[PDB]
């Protein structure tokens, strides 16, 4: 039971590590510039102690280990103190790899689009099927049933799950579902998650652009390590993915196809909108069933098919997996309406990178018709760039009427420049500004938004508690 201190602990990824660490029995403290919900509340309930600011005093007394988030850099007092005093430190992904993943059969999902859709669907299938899989993913499914076990499992976007059972062979457990992405390296360990994580089942969800080689290289770093007895699951007929494998692969492939190096798994559409389809696996005549769900779109069918195949790889029948997805209620923080104040609609969405922001805003425009649309975005900060041109963030917000981006004071990372440079170079990407205070963003909205408008808040986490702070402010405006 070590004492672990986490720098940046209120953010989704690092907070997830804190929660997993507590579940392991560790004592967990942390620092963040702000303490904000929903993660603060989850941390507090788990018995984590959070302190405000990045202060040397937070590392007194000395913890056994410091887990360092991506925003930390040299020149910061707490970091210079850490290095001078010789405290032990590690990155988030290395900590997770050593403390949780090493002992599990890890299922990692990579892709340019829809990674969290696929991981939420997969984690749902596993738990529906009675497999007590751990996970650290980008969101959670909505749980509409009165099943209090599924309610508790999906209370957080992290869950430890159980270890492979040493005595009872009837139990199928010891798994961990995770997203492979370009985030959460640290200043002293620039290895990506594609290098850190060692999945035995890997999904390559897709590989497309709304630097191909940079993305293929990163995917390759994960593919090239999978054991010979593992499985790679990906869509068929996708040259960008076939070329990824061609760099070096030692593991059997299952290829997936949605029909309306040939495929092993097929989803045949019954309803053109993707709300109903049959799933079949070529090597098992019984491995066929129907999905009849409240989701739609070809991307969601593709996501379902790779999730079903991955679950089949670890024992879930096609029948059970398809029953699970037929019961899938959707995903929290996917254009989720959280307020309607003075006729201003407020939505919450987990999009935090260009392809996700694009998809969310496409959906928002289809939904909201002619309403004036405000995008309020905290993109997920990162010291590294992967495949996406600098202009990608600004381009992704083209469909909004107004966009307010957030870059935090003291942890600036070049956002204002990438946006401002993009809007000069391509005026068609419209009206966008980068602000340095959540208070200024809220004031801007309260000041300029009017009855009929819609606001879409986008962040991988709590965005310094902007959600309730905005709803409160909007409800306090004195009408004329």
Residue numbers in the entry: 0 to 209, 216 to 265, 285 to 504
Question: Any passages from the paper?
Answer:
Recycling of the bacterial cell wall is believed to account for ∼30–60% of peptidoglycan synthesis in Gram-negative bacteria. The Mpl protein is used to link the breakdown component, the tripeptide L-Ala-γ-D-Glu-meso-A2pm (and also tetra- and pentapeptides), to UDP-MurNAc. Mpl is functionally similar to MurC, as both mechanisms involve ligation of an amino acid or peptide to UDP-MurNAc; in MurC, a single amino acid (L-Ala) is attached and in Mpl, a tri-, tetra- or pentapeptide. Mpl and MurC-F enzymes have three domains that are classified in Pfam families, PF01225 (Mur ligase catalytic domain), PF08245 (Mur ligase middle domain) and PF02875 (Mur ligase glutamate binding/C-terminal domain).
In this study, we have determined the crystal structure of a full-length apo-Mpl protein from the permafrost bacterium Psychrobacter arcticus 273-4, PaMpl (UniProt accession code Q4FVQ2_PSYA2, locus name Psyc_0032, 505 amino acids) at 1.65 Å resolution and have also biochemically characterized this enzyme. The crystal structure of PaMpl was determined by Multi-wavelength Anomalous Diffraction (MAD) phasing to a resolution of 1.65 Å. PaMpl is present as a monomer in the crystal asymmetric unit. The final model includes Gly0 (a remnant from cleavage of the expression and purification tag); residues 1–209, 216–265, and 285–504 of the protein (the full-length protein contains 505 residues); and 588 water molecules. PaMpl can be divided into 3 distinct domains: the N-terminal UDP-MurNAc-binding domain (ND, residues 1–102), the middle ATP-binding domain (MD, residues 103–357) and the C-terminal tripeptide-binding domain (CD, residues 358–505). The CD is a six-stranded, mainly parallel β-sheet (β16–β21) flanked on one side by α-helices H14-H16 and 310-helix H17, and on the other by H18–H19. These 3 domains are linked contiguously to form a triangular-shaped molecule with dimensions of ∼56×60×47 Å3. The largest conformational difference is in the disposition of the CD in Mpl, which is rotated 30° relative to ND and MD, when compared to its disposition in MurC (respectively). The corresponding residue in PaMpl is His210, but this region (residues 210–215) is disordered in our structure, probably due to the absence of metal ions. A loop (residues 404–414) from CD in PaMpl is folded into part of the ATP and UDP-MurNAc binding site. Structure analyses indicate that the orientation of the CD domain of PaMpl relative to the other domains is flexible and changes on substrate binding.
